Amino acid sequence: MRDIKTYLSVAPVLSTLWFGALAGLLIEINRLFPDALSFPFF
Amino acid sequence: EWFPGQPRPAHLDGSSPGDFGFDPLGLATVPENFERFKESEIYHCRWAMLCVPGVLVPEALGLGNWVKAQEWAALPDGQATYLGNPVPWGNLPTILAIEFLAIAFAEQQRTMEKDPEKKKYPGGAFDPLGFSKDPAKFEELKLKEIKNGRLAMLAFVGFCVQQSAYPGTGPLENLATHLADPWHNNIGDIVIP
Amino acid sequence: DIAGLTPCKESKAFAKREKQSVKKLNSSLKKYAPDSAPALAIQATIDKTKRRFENYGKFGLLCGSDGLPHLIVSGDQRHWGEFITPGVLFLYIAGWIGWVGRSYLIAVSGEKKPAMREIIIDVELAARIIPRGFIWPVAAYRELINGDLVVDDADIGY
Amino acid sequence: KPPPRGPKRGTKVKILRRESYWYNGTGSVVTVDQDPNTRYPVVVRFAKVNYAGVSTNNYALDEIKEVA
Amino acid sequence: KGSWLPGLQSPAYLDGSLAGDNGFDPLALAEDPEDLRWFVQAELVNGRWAMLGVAGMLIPEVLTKAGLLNAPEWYDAGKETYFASSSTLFVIEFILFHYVEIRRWQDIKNPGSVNQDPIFKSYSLPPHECGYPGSVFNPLNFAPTLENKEKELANGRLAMLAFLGFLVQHNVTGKGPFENLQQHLADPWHNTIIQTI
Numbered sequence: 001m002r003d004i005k006t007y008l009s010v011a012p013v014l015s016t017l018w019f020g021a022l023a024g025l026l027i028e029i030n031r032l033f034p035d036a037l038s039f040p041f042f
Numbered sequence: 043e044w045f046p047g048q049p050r051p052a053h054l055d056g057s058s059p060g061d062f063g064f065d066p067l068g069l070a071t072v073p074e075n076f077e078r079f080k081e082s083e084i085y086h087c088r089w090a091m092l093c094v095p096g097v098l099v100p101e102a103l104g105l106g107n108w109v110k111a112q113e114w115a116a117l118p119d120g121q122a123t124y125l126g127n128p129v130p131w132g133n134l135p136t137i138l139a140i141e142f143l144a145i146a147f148a149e150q151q152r153t154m155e156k157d158p159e160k161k162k163y164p165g166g167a168f169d170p171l172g173f174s175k176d177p178a179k180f181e182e183l184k185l186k187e188i189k190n191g192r193l194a195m196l197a198f199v200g201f202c203v204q205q206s207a208y209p210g211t212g213p214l215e216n217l218a219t220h221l222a223d224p225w226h227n228n229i230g231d232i233v234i235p
Numbered sequence: 236d237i238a239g240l241t242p243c244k245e246s247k248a249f250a251k252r253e254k255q256s257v258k259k260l261n262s263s264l265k266k267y268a269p270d271s272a273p274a275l276a277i278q279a280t281i282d283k284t285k286r287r288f289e290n291y292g293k294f295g296l297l298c299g300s301d302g303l304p305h306l307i308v309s310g311d312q313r314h315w316g317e318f319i320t321p322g323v324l325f326l327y328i329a330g331w332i333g334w335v336g337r338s339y340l341i342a343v344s345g346e347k348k349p350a351m352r353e354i355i356i357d358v359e360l361a362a363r364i365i366p367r368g369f370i371w372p373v374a375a376y377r378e379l380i381n382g383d384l385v386v387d388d389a390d391i392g393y
Numbered sequence: 394k395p396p397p398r399g400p401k402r403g404t405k406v407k408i409l410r411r412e413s414y415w416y417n418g419t420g421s422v423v424t425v426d427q428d429p430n431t432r433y434p435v436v437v438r439f440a441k442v443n444y445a446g447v448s449t450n451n452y453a454l455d456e457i458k459e460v461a
Numbered sequence: 462k463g464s465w466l467p468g469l470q471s472p473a474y475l476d477g478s479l480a481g482d483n484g485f486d487p488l489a490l491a492e493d494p495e496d497l498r499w500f501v502q503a504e505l506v507n508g509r510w511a512m513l514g515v516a517g518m519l520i521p522e523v524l525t526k527a528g529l530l531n532a533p534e535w536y537d538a539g540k541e542t543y544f545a546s547s548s549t550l551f552v553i554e555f556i557l558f559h560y561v562e563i564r565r566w567q568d569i570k571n572p573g574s575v576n577q578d579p580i581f582k583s584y585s586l587p588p589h590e591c592g593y594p595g596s597v598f599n600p601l602n603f604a605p606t607l608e609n610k611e612k613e614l615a616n617g618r619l620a621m622l623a624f625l626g627f628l629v630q631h632n633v634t635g636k637g638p639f640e641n642l643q644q645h646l647a648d649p650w651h652n653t654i655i656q657t658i
C-alpha cells in the first residue's frame with residue numbers, strides 16, 4: 001500500500017493531476033466569465 | 043545629532059563646524075573629497091546668502107520682478123536700471139565683460155592659492171579688525187554661517203519650485219496671498235497627489 | 236481619446252463589426268429546426284457575443300479607427316483595468332509560486348540524497364509548505380533585511 | 394610521533410585550486426597519505442558529481458582551507 | 462493558553478509570555494523572533510486604529526438615525542463641505558504624522574532613545590515598555606497589567622474584523638450598516654449575503 005503511495009508521489013502522475021485541476025479551474029472561470037478581456041472591478 | 047538614535051558614521055566625529063552627523067550616501071569617506079566638499083559647501087552657501095537679498099530687496103521696494111531685472115538682455119535695446127536709474131554704461135556688453143574679467147581673474151588668483159584653510163576662509167586683508175579675535179566666537183560664527191547658508195540654499199530651492207508652480211510671480215506676493223486666506227491658498231491645490 | 240481613439244461606446248466601426256458578426260451567425264442559424272439543440276446553442280453564442288460587445292461598451296475601452304479594442308498601458312490609472320491591476324495580480328501569483336518552490340527546496344536540501352526527494356516530492360512536507368504563499372512579499376522582505384536571501388562567495392558545491 | 398600533515402578526518406575543506414571543477418567548493422577529507430614522497434596526498438569526497446562522473450580526486454595542502 | 466484547537470499542540474513560537482497567545486499561526490510566519498516583535502507592534506497599532514475607526518463608523522450612524530444629531534455617513538463625509546478644504550488638512554496630517562510615526566519607528570529600532578521631548582528638558586518621559594508607552598499617554602495611572610493587554614488585543618482583533626466587514630458590506634451595498642442590522646432584525650433569513658447576490 002505505502003509502495004503505491006510513494007509511486008503516486010512520483011512527479012509524472014502528480015504533475016498530470018495538478019495540471020488537470022488547474023486547467024479545469026481555468027476553463028470553469030472562462031465559462032463563468034466569457035471573454036473576460038479587462039478588469040472591470042476597480 | 044540631526045537624527046536621534048541613528049549612530050553617527052565613522053568619519054563624522056563632529057570635529058568640524060556644521061557636522062551634525064548627516065551623511066547617508068557616505069561620500070565623505072575620502073579625505074580629499076571631504077575637504078573639497080567643505081570648500082564647495084562654503085562657496086555655495088556664501089553665494090546664495092549674498093544672492094537672496096538681491097531678489098528680496100528689489101521685489102518689495104521700488105523695483106519690479108526679479109525675472110525682469112535681466113529682461114534687458116532678451117530684447118536688443120535693454121539697459122539696466124538702478125531703482126529708476128539707467129546708468130550710462132549699464133549696457134549688456136560692459137557688465138558682461140567686467141563679470142568675465144573680474145570673476146575669472148580674481149577667483150583664479152584666489153583659488154590657485156592653497157593654504158588650504160584660506161580657500162574656505164579667506165581672511166588676510168579680509169580680517170584686519172580682528173573679527174577672528176575670539177576662537178570660541180570664531181567657531182561659533184563659522185557654525186552660524188554654515189547654518190544660515192544652508193537655509194539660504196533651501197530658500198533658493200523654494201524660489202525655484204514656487205516660480206515654477208506659479209508662472210511669473212513674486213515671493214512676497216504669493217506670501218501675502220496665501221496668508222490673506224489660510225485654508226484654501228496653499229500647496230494643496232498643487233498636490234492632492 | 237488618447238491620440239484620438241474614441242471609445243466604442245461611441246464609435247461606429249465597432250457597431251459594424253458587431254452587426255456583420257451577428258448577421259452571419261443569424262444567416263447560418265436558419266438552416267435547421269428553430270428548436271434543434273445545435274440551433275439553440277447557435278442562438279446562445281449569438282446572444283453571448285452580443286453581451287460581450289455590450290460589456291466592452293461599458294468599461295471605457297478606447298477603440299481603434301478600424302473597429303477594434305486597443306489597450307492603453309501608458310501608466311494613467313484611468314485605463315488600468317487592462318495592465319496595472321492584472322499586472323500586480325499576476326506578480327503576486329508569480330511571487331507566490333517562486334517563494335513556495337524556493338522554500339521547499341531550501342527545506343528539503345537537508346537530507347541524504349536530496350535528488351530522491353526532488354524527483355519524488357515529499358507530498359506531506361509539500362502540503363505543509365505550500366499554503367505559505369500569503370507570506371511571500373513580507374517574508375522574503377525580512378530575508379533581504381537580514382541578508383539571508385543571497386550569498387557572497389559560495390558558488391559551487393552548495 | 395612525527396606530526397602527520399593534512400587535516401585529521403571529516404574536516405570540511407574549501408578548495409583553493411582554480412583548475413578543478415570544485416574551485417571554491419566544499420568537500421570532505423577521507424584520508425591523507427603520510428608519505429613525504431607524494432605530490433598530492435589528500436583526497437576529498439564531494440556531494441556534487443562532476444562531468445567525468447568522478448566524485449573524488451587529489452590535492453596538496455596549499456590548495457586547501459580547513460574551514461569549519 | 463486557549464489553543465483555539467482543543468487537540469493541536471502550540472508551536473514553540475508563541476509560548477504564552479506575550480499577551481493573547483493561542484498558538485494561532487497555522488502558516489508559521491513569525492517563527493523568527495524579531496519578525497514576531499514586528500508583527501506584535503503591527504497588530505497593536507492596527508487594532509488601536511481599527512477600534513478608533515469602527516467607533517467613528519458605528520456611533521455617528523446611530524446618533525444620526527436617533528434624531529439627536531445630524532452628520533453624514535463616514536463615506537458620505539468626504540464630499541461634505543467644511544471650514545477647511547481637503548488638501549489643506551491632508552498635508553497638515555501628513556507633516557504631523559511624518560513626525561509622530563517616524564519617532565515611533567525610531568523607538569522601535571532603538572529601545573529608550575528618543576524619549577525626551579527635545580524642546581524642553583524636564584517634563585520629558587519616564588522610561589517605557591515597547592508597545593506600551595509611558596506617562597503622557599496613560600494619565601489616569603492605569604497599571605499596565607495582564608487582562609488589560611489581553612482585553613485590548615482581543616477587542617482590537619474583533620475591531621479589525623468588524624472594520625473589514627464594514628468596508629466589504631459598503632462595497633456590496635453602499636448603505637449604512639445599522640440599516641443592514643434593522644433589515645436583518647426584520648427577517649434574518651430574508652436578509653443576508655445570499656439574497657443580495
Ligand code: CLA
Pocket residue numbers: 619622623625626627629630633634641642644645652653654655657
Ligand atoms: C464583526 C463582524 C461582522 C458582523 C457583526 C457582520 C454582520 C453582518 N454582515 Mg458581514 N462581513 C464581515 C464581518 C461581519 N459581518 C466580514 C469580515 C466580511 C468579509 C468576509 C463580511 C461580509 C459580508 C457580506 C458580503 C454581507 C455581510 C452581511 C452582513 C449582515 C447579515 C449577515 C450575513 O449575511 O452574513 C454575514 C456574511 C459574512 C461573510 C460574514 C462573515 C464574518 C466572519 C465569518 C466572522 C464573523 C464571526 C462572528 C464571531 C459571528 C458573528 C458575531 C455576531 C453575532 C456578534 C450582518 C449585519 C450581508 C448584509 O449586509 O446583508 C444584510 C452581506 O451581504 N457581511
Ligand code: CLA
Pocket residue numbers: 332333334335336337339356361365
Ligand atoms: C520555484 C523555483 C524557481 C525559482 C524561484 C526560479 C527563479 C529564477 N529563475 Mg528559474 N527555473 C526553474 C525554477 C525556478 N526558477 C525551473 C524548474 C527551471 C527549468 C524549467 C528554470 C529555468 C530557468 C531558466 C532557463 C532561467 C531561469 C531564470 C531565473 C531567474 C529569473 C527569473 C526567470 O527568468 O524565470 C523565468 C521563469 C521560468 C524559467 C519558469 C520556471 C519556473 C518553474 C515552472 C517553477 C517550478 C516550481 C516547482 C518545480 C513545482 C513544485 C511546486 C512545489 C509544491 C514544490 C530567477 C532567479 C533565468 C536567469 O538565469 O535569470 C538570471 C533564466 O535564464 N530559470
Ligand SMILES: CC(/C=C/C=C(C)/C=C/[C@@]12O[C@]1(C)C[C@@H](O)CC2(C)C)=C\C=C\C=C(C)\C=C\C=C(C)\C=C\[C@@]12O[C@]1(C)C[C@@H](O)CC2(C)C
Pocket residue numbers: 369485486487488489490506507508510511513514515517518534535536538621622624625
Ligand atoms: C483584518 C486585519 C488583519 C487580519 C489578519 C489576520 C486575521 C491574519 C491571520 C493569520 O496571520 C495569522 C494570525 C496566523 C497565520 O498562520 C494565519 C493567518 C490567517 C495568515 C486587519 C485590519 C485592520 C484594520 C484597520 C487597521 C482599520 C483601521 C480603520 C481606520 C483607521 C478607519 C478610519 C476611518 O473611520 C475613520 C477613522 C473616519 C471615517 O470617516 C473615515 C475612515 C478613514 C474610513
Ligand SMILES: CC1=C[C@H](O)CC(C)(C)[C@H]1/C=C/C(C)=C/C=C/C(C)=C/C=C/C=C(C)/C=C/C=C(C)/C=C/C1=C(C)C[C@H](O)CC1(C)C
Pocket residue numbers: 064065066067068069085086087089090092093094095096097108111112195196198199
Ligand atoms: C542676487 C540675485 C538677484 C538678481 O536679480 C538675479 C540673480 C542674479 C539670479 C540673483 C542671485 C544670484 C546668485 C549669486 C545665485 C546663486 C545661488 C546659489 C549659489 C545657489 C546654490 C544652491 C545650492 C544648493 C541648494 C545645494 C544643495 C545641495 C544639497 C541639498 C545636497 C545634499 C546632500 C548632501 C549634502 C550629502 C548627502 O550625502 C547627499 C545629499 C542629499 C545629495
